[PDB]
Amino acid sequence: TTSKAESTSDPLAALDDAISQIDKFRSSLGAVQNRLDSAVTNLNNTTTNL
């Protein structure tokens, strides 16, 4: 039921990969934010004209 744990093989590389993943998710959210802002501007202009 129990296995002795030694350590991570490469402690720094795994943390760097986690940082890369979280940064990519940041980038996705930022792109979504900018796209939504552009959509809001479009919608305001369109409703004004209509």
């Binding site: 940082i19 940064d23 940041r26 980038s27 959210l29 930022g30 792109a31 934010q33 900018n34 802002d37 501007t41 305001n44 202009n45 004004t48």
Partner: protein, 50 residues
């Protein structure tokens, strides 16, 4: 000659709305001191800073 439903004050409101985002971003940038506060700005630069 018509009552405010063809009013060009809607255009004024739209321009004020577009200016409000710039004003808010300017004040927030001034307060923070960092060019990038979130990924809505250049996300690649944010990752590089990280």
């Amino acid at each position: 000659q018509v009552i405010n439903t063809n009013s060009l004050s809607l255009i004024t409101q739209n321009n004020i709305n577009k200016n409000q985002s710039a004003l808010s971003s300017s004040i927030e940038r001034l307060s923070s001191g960092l060019r990038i506060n979130s990924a809505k700005d250049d996300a690649a630069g944010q990752a590089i800073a990280n």
